[PDB]
Amino acid sequence: QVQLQESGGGLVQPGGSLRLSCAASGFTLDYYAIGWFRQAPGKEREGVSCISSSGGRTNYADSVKGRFTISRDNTKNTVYLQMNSLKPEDTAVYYCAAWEASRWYCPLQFSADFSSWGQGTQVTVSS
Amino acid sequence: VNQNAQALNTLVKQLSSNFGAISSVLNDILSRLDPPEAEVQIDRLITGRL
Amino acid sequence: YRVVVLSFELLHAPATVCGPKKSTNLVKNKCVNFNFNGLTGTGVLTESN
Amino acid sequence: NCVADYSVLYNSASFSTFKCYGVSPTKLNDLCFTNVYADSFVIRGDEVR
């Protein structure tokens, strides 16, 4: 009954802003580390941003520094991703994945297995 | 004498029942599952044994 | 996607595969926490005929 | 009749699925078993579920 559900996708103007949500049902999302992942048309699934279980550690892809902000609410069992200064290069389907650290060290910069995945949401940037 | 011994013999044999848990032996459940999941099995042992 | 399933079998039998851990010395006639072939417990061991 | 080092597998961070049932994946090195069976195959992605 474990479910991950994305929300907030849509069509926006380049330079505008959009905000995504990932909600978890059937389990407590606070203990898991969550990462936002996108696949562009004709491209492979790249890691956009990740946040630790407690939220004290974060990592972002160099394409999105200064533009995207990730955070989570462990009381509301949600993880949020805010997008600002949005560009046509970001047109993709966005997944949220929850997993646990498979390596030593606090940071989440490395990639690993991702235990649970959502169905993805579409954000299109075109003007 | 027979009735008293049978009552104690029955009590001992009840320790080998699972009461719905994965194992009747308490040390196995502790050595196998984490406390968030081990405890659920212990409560099944506790309810049956109590 | 390359899939490997690992079914671990756990019965009351000798264990032939065991994980990375260090075996220690054996002491007798004293109250110990013992672990023989995965069987954990606490008690005092005695020579048996 | 061989030692299983599950840390090499678990901490590899290359496998796209780590689903353990009845045993926690971090205690695979602490419990041990009489035998383990390995089945290795290639399957599509919408189907590893």
XYZ file of N, CA, C and O in Angstrom, chain C:
196
model
N 16.862 -5.241 -17.607
C 17.283 -5.117 -16.215
C 17.636 -6.492 -15.678
O 16.812 -7.409 -15.720
N 18.854 -6.624 -15.164
C 19.377 -7.904 -14.708
C 18.962 -8.133 -13.261
O 19.321 -7.351 -12.376
N 18.217 -9.210 -13.025
C 17.576 -9.477 -11.743
C 18.193 -10.729 -11.139
O 18.313 -11.756 -11.814
N 18.585 -10.639 -9.869
C 19.038 -11.788 -9.096
C 18.222 -11.844 -7.815
O 18.149 -10.855 -7.079
N 17.611 -12.994 -7.547
C 16.859 -13.214 -6.320
C 17.676 -14.124 -5.412
O 18.307 -15.083 -5.874
N 17.710 -13.784 -4.128
C 18.485 -14.517 -3.130
C 17.526 -15.003 -2.051
O 17.152 -14.240 -1.155
N 17.130 -16.269 -2.133
C 16.250 -16.870 -1.138
C 17.111 -17.513 -0.057
O 17.753 -18.541 -0.294
N 17.129 -16.909 1.129
C 17.848 -17.467 2.264
C 16.952 -18.462 2.987
O 15.802 -18.149 3.314
N 17.479 -19.656 3.231
C 16.734 -20.721 3.885
C 17.175 -20.822 5.340
O 18.375 -20.893 5.628
N 16.202 -20.822 6.251
C 16.456 -20.775 7.691
C 15.655 -21.881 8.370
O 14.477 -21.701 8.687
N 16.298 -23.019 8.596
C 15.724 -24.115 9.363
C 16.655 -24.470 10.519
O 17.703 -23.850 10.720
N 16.256 -25.486 11.283
C 17.046 -25.969 12.414
C 18.009 -27.030 11.888
O 17.772 -28.238 11.972
N 19.119 -26.556 11.333
C 20.068 -27.408 10.631
C 21.424 -26.716 10.648
O 21.516 -25.526 10.981
N 22.501 -27.435 10.319
C 23.809 -26.778 10.215
C 23.785 -25.666 9.178
O 23.176 -25.796 8.115
N 24.465 -24.569 9.494
C 24.570 -23.430 8.594
C 25.883 -23.517 7.829
O 26.955 -23.612 8.435
N 25.796 -23.487 6.499
C 26.978 -23.598 5.656
C 27.441 -22.265 5.088
O 28.601 -22.155 4.677
N 26.576 -21.258 5.060
C 26.941 -19.915 4.630
C 26.745 -18.994 5.828
O 25.676 -18.993 6.454
N 27.807 -18.286 6.215
C 27.733 -17.341 7.320
C 28.495 -16.061 7.005
O 29.531 -16.078 6.335
N 27.965 -14.948 7.519
C 28.438 -13.634 7.155
C 29.749 -13.282 7.818
O 30.328 -14.052 8.597
N 30.244 -12.081 7.506
C 31.562 -11.677 8.012
C 31.518 -11.275 9.476
O 31.109 -10.158 9.810
N 31.968 -12.173 10.352
C 32.053 -11.922 11.784
C 33.197 -12.749 12.348
O 33.654 -13.715 11.733
N 33.650 -12.361 13.535
C 34.836 -12.943 14.149
C 34.435 -13.916 15.249
O 33.693 -13.551 16.168
N 34.924 -15.149 15.151
C 34.703 -16.137 16.196
C 35.697 -15.928 17.331
O 36.875 -15.642 17.100
N 35.216 -16.072 18.561
C 36.006 -15.810 19.755
C 36.331 -17.116 20.474
O 36.014 -18.214 20.006
N 36.977 -16.980 21.629
C 37.381 -18.129 22.424
C 36.173 -18.765 23.108
O 35.075 -18.202 23.157
N 36.389 -19.966 23.639
C 35.371 -20.719 24.359
C 35.750 -20.782 25.833
O 36.863 -21.199 26.172
N 34.833 -20.371 26.707
C 35.035 -20.490 28.145
C 33.920 -21.372 28.689
O 32.799 -21.380 28.168
N 34.235 -22.128 29.738
C 33.337 -23.135 30.275
C 33.068 -22.860 31.749
O 33.836 -22.169 32.425
N 31.958 -23.415 32.236
C 31.543 -23.303 33.637
C 31.438 -21.846 34.087
O 31.896 -21.468 35.167
N 30.819 -21.018 33.247
C 30.583 -19.629 33.612
C 29.388 -19.097 32.834
O 29.067 -19.584 31.747
N 28.735 -18.087 33.407
C 27.545 -17.491 32.811
C 27.957 -16.621 31.630
O 28.632 -15.602 31.811
N 27.557 -17.020 30.421
C 27.998 -16.356 29.202
C 26.805 -16.077 28.298
O 25.739 -16.683 28.422
N 27.005 -15.132 27.385
C 26.147 -14.970 26.220
C 26.803 -15.717 25.064
O 27.891 -15.340 24.616
N 26.150 -16.769 24.584
C 26.749 -17.676 23.617
C 26.046 -17.584 22.270
O 24.870 -17.217 22.183
N 26.788 -17.921 21.215
C 26.269 -17.935 19.847
C 26.936 -19.096 19.116
O 28.058 -18.961 18.617
N 26.246 -20.231 19.056
C 26.738 -21.429 18.385
C 25.965 -21.607 17.086
O 24.759 -21.878 17.111
N 26.661 -21.463 15.957
C 26.085 -21.727 14.637
C 24.815 -20.912 14.405
O 23.859 -21.378 13.782
N 24.803 -19.680 14.912
C 23.650 -18.815 14.801
C 22.639 -18.946 15.921
O 21.696 -18.147 15.976
N 22.801 -19.921 16.811
C 21.901 -20.104 17.945
C 22.376 -19.216 19.088
O 23.389 -19.509 19.730
N 21.642 -18.140 19.344
C 22.002 -17.176 20.372
C 21.243 -17.466 21.660
O 20.118 -17.972 21.643
N 21.875 -17.141 22.780
C 21.255 -17.361 24.069
C 22.189 -16.944 25.182
O 23.258 -16.379 24.944
N 21.766 -17.229 26.410
C 22.574 -16.945 27.587
C 22.466 -18.111 28.556
O 21.361 -18.574 28.852
N 23.607 -18.581 29.040
C 23.622 -19.703 29.960
C 25.045 -20.082 30.299
O 26.008 -19.435 29.873
N 25.166 -21.152 31.082
C 26.454 -21.692 31.500
C 26.638 -23.052 30.843
O 25.726 -23.887 30.860
N 27.807 -23.267 30.248
C 28.097 -24.492 29.519
C 28.890 -25.453 30.393
O 29.739 -25.037 31.185
N 28.602 -26.741 30.239
C 29.261 -27.791 30.997
C 29.605 -28.924 30.041
O 28.925 -29.129 29.033
N 30.685 -29.641 30.343
C 31.005 -30.838 29.578
C 29.913 -31.885 29.770
O 29.394 -32.072 30.873
N 29.551 -32.557 28.680
C 28.443 -33.500 28.684
C 28.909 -34.855 28.172
O 29.732 -34.934 27.255
N 28.376 -35.916 28.772
C 28.714 -37.282 28.395
C 27.813 -37.838 27.301
O 27.981 -39.000 26.915
